[PDB]
Design a protein around this nucleic acid. Sequence first.
RNA 1: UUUUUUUUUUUUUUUUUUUUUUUUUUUUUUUUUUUUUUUUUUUUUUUUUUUUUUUUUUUUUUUUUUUUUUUUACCA
RNA 2: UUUUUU
RNA 3: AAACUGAAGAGUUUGAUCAUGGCUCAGAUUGAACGCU
RNA 4: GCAAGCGUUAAUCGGAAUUACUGGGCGUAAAGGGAGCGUAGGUGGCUCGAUAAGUCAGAUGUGAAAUCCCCGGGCUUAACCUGGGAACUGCAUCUGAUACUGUUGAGCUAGAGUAUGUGAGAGGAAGGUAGAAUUCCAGGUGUAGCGGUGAAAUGCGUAGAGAUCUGGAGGAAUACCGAUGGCGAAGGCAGCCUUCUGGCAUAAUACUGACACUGAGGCUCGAAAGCGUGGGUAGCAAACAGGAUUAGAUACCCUGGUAGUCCACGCCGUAAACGAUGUCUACUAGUCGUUGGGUCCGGACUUAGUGACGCAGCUAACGCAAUAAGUAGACCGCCUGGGGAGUACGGCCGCAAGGUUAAAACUCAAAUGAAUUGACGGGGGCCCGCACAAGCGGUGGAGCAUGUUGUUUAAUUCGAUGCAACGCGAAGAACCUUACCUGGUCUUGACAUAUCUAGAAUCCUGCAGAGAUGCGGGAGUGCCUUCGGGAAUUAGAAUACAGGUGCUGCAUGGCUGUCGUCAGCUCGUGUCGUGAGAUGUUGGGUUAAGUCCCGCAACGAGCGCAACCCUUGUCCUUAGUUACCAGGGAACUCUAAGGAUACUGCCAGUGACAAACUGGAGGAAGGCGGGGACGACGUCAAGUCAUCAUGGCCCUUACGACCAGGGCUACACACGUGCUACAAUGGUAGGUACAGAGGGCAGCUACACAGCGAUGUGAUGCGAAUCUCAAAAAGCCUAUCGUAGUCCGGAUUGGAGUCUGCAACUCGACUCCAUGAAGUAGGAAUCGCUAGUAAUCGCGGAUCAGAAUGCCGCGGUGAAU
Length: 205
Amino acid sequence: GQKVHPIGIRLGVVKKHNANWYASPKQYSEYLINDIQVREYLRKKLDSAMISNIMIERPTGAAKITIATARPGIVIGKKGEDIERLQKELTKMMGVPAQVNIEEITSPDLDARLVADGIGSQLERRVMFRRAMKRAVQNSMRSGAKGIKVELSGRLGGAEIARTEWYREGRVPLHTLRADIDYASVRAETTYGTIGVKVWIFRGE
RNA sequence: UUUUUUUUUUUUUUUUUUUUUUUUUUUUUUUUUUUUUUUUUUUUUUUUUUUUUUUUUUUUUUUUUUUUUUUUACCA
RNA sequence: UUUUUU
RNA sequence: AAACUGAAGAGUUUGAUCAUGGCUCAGAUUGAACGCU
RNA sequence: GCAAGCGUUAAUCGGAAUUACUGGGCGUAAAGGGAGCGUAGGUGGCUCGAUAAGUCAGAUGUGAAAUCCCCGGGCUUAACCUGGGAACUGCAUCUGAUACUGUUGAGCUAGAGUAUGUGAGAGGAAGGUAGAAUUCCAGGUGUAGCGGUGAAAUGCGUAGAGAUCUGGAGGAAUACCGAUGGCGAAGGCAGCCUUCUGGCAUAAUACUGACACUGAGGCUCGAAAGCGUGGGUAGCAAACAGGAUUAGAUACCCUGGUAGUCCACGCCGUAAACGAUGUCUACUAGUCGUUGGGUCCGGACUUAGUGACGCAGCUAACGCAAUAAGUAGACCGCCUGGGGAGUACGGCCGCAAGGUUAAAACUCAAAUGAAUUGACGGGGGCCCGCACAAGCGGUGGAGCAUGUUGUUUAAUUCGAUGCAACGCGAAGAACCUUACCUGGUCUUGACAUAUCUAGAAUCCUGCAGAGAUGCGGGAGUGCCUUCGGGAAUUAGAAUACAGGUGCUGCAUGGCUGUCGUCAGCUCGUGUCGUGAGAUGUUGGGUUAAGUCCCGCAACGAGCGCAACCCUUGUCCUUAGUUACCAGGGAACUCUAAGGAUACUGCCAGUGACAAACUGGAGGAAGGCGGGGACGACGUCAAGUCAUCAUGGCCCUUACGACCAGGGCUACACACGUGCUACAAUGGUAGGUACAGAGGGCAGCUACACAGCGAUGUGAUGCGAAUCUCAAAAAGCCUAUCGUAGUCCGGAUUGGAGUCUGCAACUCGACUCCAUGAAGUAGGAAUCGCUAGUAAUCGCGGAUCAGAAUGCCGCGGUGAAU
């Protein structure tokens, strides 16, 4: 526990906030609470389709939610009937129409959250942690990442003593502020406890 | 028995001349030390064996007892 | 000159 | 014609190593005993 | 896995090459006898013969049968029985062979010895002698110290020391030479001279003719200490005495000091007696020293020693390496896990001390060698950081605030505990928070889904009660679809369950501290090593930096460093309101976006023809311009299950849930952080200046009036570059106080109020009047700070109804070193 968040330290130099609205000092708190509610609802509902970058920007009441997923087809549904239900469920627990327009991740091996959640799903499927970690490294490296680091922390393989393991390939220079490093941290709820999964994908400058 | 020596702080020792209680070691609190020693700062601490007696005042002067040491306890 | 221990 | 056919190692000293070196084990055997059957 | 058996125990061999004949070792792991001489023994040169014992071959006799093995035969198969073979590695007697061993005859010279000439040497034994120096004694001069130590003190000295000079006595050792130099079997042996005496080295000739090597027992010699008798006795010095040091100091240091050390003659018989390496022989790259000879032309060669390197070979490695630990041979000694133990007992030796030979029980699964990586050292070298030093100001003493301990309580909720817990979680406990205590209560429950019964929810009410709660009365009849009805909704009908700040941070995730913003930490390939590993990453510089350059069996890479980010320092451009004011202006400040500049870029030197450093110019800025964020691999089973999430454990009319009151605020006490002071560089009373940043509808308030004041009423502007908080204080001028516990300090207490809030008793903050406590500069000890810093002065904000001396920021003045 001695490292800054890669996204947060880069929030203004090369990255952008995944929430772009403006409020007044009194309105801001309720905007933020509603935003966090929508985010947690979305991440629990669309847990099948591999969404990674839900972005909330609300211009004057009406909002424009933008989810980026690697599998837009399943979350949109047939002719677009799941997306309408999602639209109205968002609108119900926000103020007025939440236009959710859905992007597409054309390289799911370069997004850190998709890699981390894949490793997590494999871990909850009682797959060897070393093999899952190495598979993710290989997949990202041959998909074209300039660097990938993946850290697995916890009771790995049912071990009584938790340990931290990791693999790195490429550069992933955390201290460089202009590095374009995607980062994700998820948890796999195994049968022996929680295993934390951290993924750094360094893509350029 | 006897004659001398005395008995005081936790201990072992100083007083004292009627007008007061002492070092040292402790002990307690601090401080140095990772922590304990050592060390350094502070403190606390005496029915002066007891009991009559004299004095305005006694641990100190008298008398008794009581512990302590000694030294004696011999002749048939 | 004088630093014992765990 | 034949009597000419036979040879395995492991554990344990160290943070690790190689050596030394003891201890221990896997085999065969019995005029056997004991326990369960 | 075995199976009518399967396991255990006992016992033997195996594995164990762990007694090694096959088939081990002894430099450092256990192991070379202290060294020699030599007895028994073992082994042993060349040539020509003899013999035929060993040896080899053949034949014969025998080596019982059974068993083992081979080929078969009979039991239904098999076990079993059985025929014939093979074998029985042996012994005996004859015959043959003669390479080797034995026994012999003759011969030989190469191993080993002899005679003769030269040479070196601390080889040994006995005498004598010399010169320095110490000590002692006796004198002359001389006067107050000497001596000793890290300091001292003991000690010596005015009865005259020490110093200096002159005589005398005596003992021991032999500076310089002096040297991995010499000699000796080892132990050992140093002045010089004589005597007695051993070995060695060397050139040639002659001679003997295997006379040799090794060697159990045995004998001899054998450092130092020690023992006996008799002498000696200067210095040194066990013991011993005193002085110091120390917690102690039977020591180390100091001052003395006896045995002993010296001699003679004897004992002892042991040493890390070491090269931790038995002796002897042969052979096997080389290079450079040195000692004693010799031969040739200052060198060359050859010998016997004595050293340093270094192949092959050897070794576990270190290392050895013609002076082997290599390649072989002869003989001897020794080892067989660590302790017990080189001990006991018994012999033998000894005057004794003791030596020598040498077990066992028992006990433990190790004990060891060499090397590797770290860590550490009261090891070495180089370097950095407010680490010290140089300074400035504090803390530790007072009162108060706050946190913790302890104590006390019904409870004083829980966690944080060396740095890196203690104004920490908590960015703000009257109720709430709240997790604790007392009491009053509820049980699918305050909260989610499954469900079916009525109703739009929702609003207004009465009483009882501290409240949670309990019992009752009125208004409303939703909306879309419409007679199935639906997003919400109130009271349960029950099972699932919910709920748990209950436990385990030593089951965990996430998050954080810390070494430490220290400069490190690794990897791939290559190479080296049996290997753990190494190299890279080390070295010469250089840097803030594993920064950079150059070397280099390394070549490269990664995370760290730096840079990219924010802020500040100068300028330019766009823009000019609510900002600004030089002459409505578009100058300026400012505001807030985008850029410019700074790069060792230029100059001079130093530097390996480098990296780099030193100084200079220009510039607002000069070398990293200043400040921040950014915290490598990892370490502390570091902190957090009470933010959260979570594995497991635990409670489900209760450890869950609701309400009122109380507690978290108690104080013999102790500590940690602070604030206010102890005053004159100041207090007080008047004037008069100069900020920044931040907040404001969950509000800030112009102004007026009332009040001593906190505040209260009316009212105005402002979601703010507009209005406001708001006046900055320290500062400057004048007066006064005149060193006093005061005109310092402002705790504590009494009284009266204002606000916030349902509510100020426990337990709020301010205001006013009165009181006026300790405190006069703080022990041992200890902390922060290197420049706009410390010190000091005010001003904002988060949390927040109210409640900062804490936290987070802002500017003012502004050092010392």
